[PDB]
Design a protein around this ligand. Sequence first.
Ligand code: CA
Ligand code: CA
Ligand code: CA
Ligand code: CA
Ligand code: CA
Ligand code: CA
Ligand code: CA
Ligand code: CA
Ligand code: CA
Ligand code: CA
Ligand code: K
Ligand code: K
Ligand code: K
Lengths: 74, 55, 53, 100, 81, 82
Amino acid sequence: DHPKYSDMIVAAIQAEKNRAGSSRQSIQKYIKSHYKVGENADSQIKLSIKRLVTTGVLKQTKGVGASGSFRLAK
Amino acid sequence: LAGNAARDNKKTRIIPRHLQLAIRNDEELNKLLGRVTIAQGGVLPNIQAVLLPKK
Amino acid sequence: LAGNAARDNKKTRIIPRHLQLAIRNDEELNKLLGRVTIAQGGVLPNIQAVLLP
Amino acid sequence: KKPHRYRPGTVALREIRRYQKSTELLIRKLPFQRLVREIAQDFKTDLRFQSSAVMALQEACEAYLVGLFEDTNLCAIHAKRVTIMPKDIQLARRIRGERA
Amino acid sequence: LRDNIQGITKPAIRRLARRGGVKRISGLIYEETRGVLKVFLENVIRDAVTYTEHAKRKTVTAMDVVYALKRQGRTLYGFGG
Amino acid sequence: VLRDNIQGITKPAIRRLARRGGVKRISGLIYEETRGVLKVFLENVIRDAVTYTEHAKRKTVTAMDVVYALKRQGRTLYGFGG
DNA sequence: CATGCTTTTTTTTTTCATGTGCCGGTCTCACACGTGCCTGGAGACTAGTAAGCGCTTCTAGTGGCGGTTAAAACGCGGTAGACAGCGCGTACGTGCGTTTAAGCGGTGCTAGAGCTGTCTACGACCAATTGAGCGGCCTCGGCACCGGGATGCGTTTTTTTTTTCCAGCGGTAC
DNA sequence: CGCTGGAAAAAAAAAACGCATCCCGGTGCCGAGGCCGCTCAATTGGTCGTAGACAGCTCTAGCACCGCTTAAACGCACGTACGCGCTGTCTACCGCGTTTTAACCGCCACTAGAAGCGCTTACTAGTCTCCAGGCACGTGTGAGACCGGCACATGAAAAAAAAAAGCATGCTCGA
Ligand SMILES: [Ca+2]
Ligand SMILES: [Ca+2]
Ligand SMILES: [Ca+2]
Ligand SMILES: [Ca+2]
Ligand SMILES: [Ca+2]
Ligand SMILES: [Ca+2]
Ligand SMILES: [Ca+2]
Ligand SMILES: [Ca+2]
Ligand SMILES: [Ca+2]
Ligand SMILES: [Ca+2]
Ligand SMILES: [K+]
Ligand SMILES: [K+]
Ligand SMILES: [K+]
């Protein structure tokens, strides 16, 4: 019942230990444990990241489209 | 049961009221005849406690 | 009446609840089906005045 | 940090609106099924049940109770109360001709 | 029998009474209801089983319940009236 | 043609009925309330009774007509036959 | 009792928070529709009756009449009950953080519901035979109905234990 | 105000008046009870077709079991509103007396219409034969159900601000 898979990601890298790169599986594991979820959530965080990748807000440090690490603009 | 109710009213002959008294006082007959009206039956004497005078 | 209740819920298909709503809202059908339970029917929304704030 | 807290009754009302709107069975399906078989043992053991038969019993039960509550509620209110109590149910059943 | 009648949880009764448009529920009601509910199922099932036994069956059918409820004056639609 | 026999159901007669019902004190409003209920009863029962009369092609309402009618209304009566 | 003053009190607005309602995009199950076949409804007969109909018997339903007298009705006065109001004590509601098991999807086995074919007891149908029990007459005795009288229960009057409501001294705060 | 005594009213006694009910025996009527004679239903005994008992066969559905996760239940802490019990007001109802009414009873006369019975044929049961409408099973695709994210209405709290609720004034009758 806590929406914004944006907010979800954003809160997860935040409470994630200081990195210059943070991986999808390391955030997909935080979001599932710290909030209510389905099972397409794994597949929704996938889509959620690709939108945050797109708008310039989350820029990815290592890797490619899905399997990589992601950082915060400023 | 009616025959008993009649002896209990110094009457030789069962009348409706006897049949009613018999039926309404027997838990099981009452339940069987729950939706039945007995002609000239009257009702069981019963005055709710709170309606009786104070002492 | 059910068909109306369904149009009133943007549903193509009548479901139980529709049949109940139809019946309980029509004085005469209610009275006919006074001692009938409709599977998955629900009850008419109705909160006694004195219960409101 | 201040806590948010609905006044006593505000939720109850919300719950009322919620469940009146809906038709889903309100008793948990298994605990009911066990209660059915438990009660049926008294009349004959090694009895089997069509799942539809159990569901029918549950539809009937919930419907019956929901009904009894509606009637009870009125009895409670009729006594200038808002809180249903056993004596309210008893009146409702006594008048319904369910009990003596 | 664990007294599965406890399986009829407080919150489930609360729920039913909510659909009945009840706002406030005395603690005593939760046991009261279980008792009434039991009495109901006893009376209905008894009859259902009696129909089962008459059919020389070992399996209670929906119809057994349907026919039983009709007798009790609580007719049920949508299980094969 | 003769209307308003419903007043013929006198206050004291209603008092009497309610006494047999074990009522101790009766609000003035009750006497009209009761007449109305009583009327509704007779309307519903007689309607059916007559309907049975008409089906028998009779012009005379029999006790049985009333008995059969009351059975329908779930208010069975014993001691007027069948 | 009009000014003015401070104080609190209720009345208005702000401010959050919620929830809940609405809307896009996606994924499944169940409606819907067809196929193909099987049986139950249709047809066109013959047979047997129920029931319409018209006339006949007589029950009991209607309607009127007039003489009590039981019951309704109107009115008065006075309690005792309905009802609002206010205050006190806690049981009920909300929510949060912790415990549980219902639920879901899945797998495997067979109890038993159901279906078929076959045989024979059982029940219907029918024609003779007859006593049960029906309607109809007649006869006691239960009971209903009275009234008189004894007892039982409510009410009032009087008494009496019982609460209460002023005063007073003391005696201590302005 | 507290603590002790005084007369002043106040449930809690008793003793007196009265009304209603119960209980007793006596008397007079109505219906229960029984009997008789007549009628129709049951009985009997038989003949003939079929309902359903049963055994065997099929295969549906009900059950048992397993391994999850999540939604639901549970339990505990906190405090608000509700129950309800006490106190007090006002008057609606109860009870009872005189005045009114029309139900009740009993009897009478007249007639619908209930109930009955027999004549007759339209009307339904009933049969074998025929066949299509609707059944069980298969297939498809589109509602609608589920989601996650966003503007929506409705609640509960804090704040700000008009609205009514109590201590401190100068002025002018009237004693
Ligand atoms: Ca679906
Ligand atoms: Ca389609
Ligand atoms: Ca005939
Ligand atoms: Ca309390
Ligand atoms: Ca435990
Ligand atoms: Ca005798
Ligand atoms: Ca007599
Ligand atoms: Ca003494
Ligand atoms: Ca002094
Ligand atoms: Ca003093
Ligand atoms: K005919
Ligand atoms: K007649
Ligand atoms: K089966």
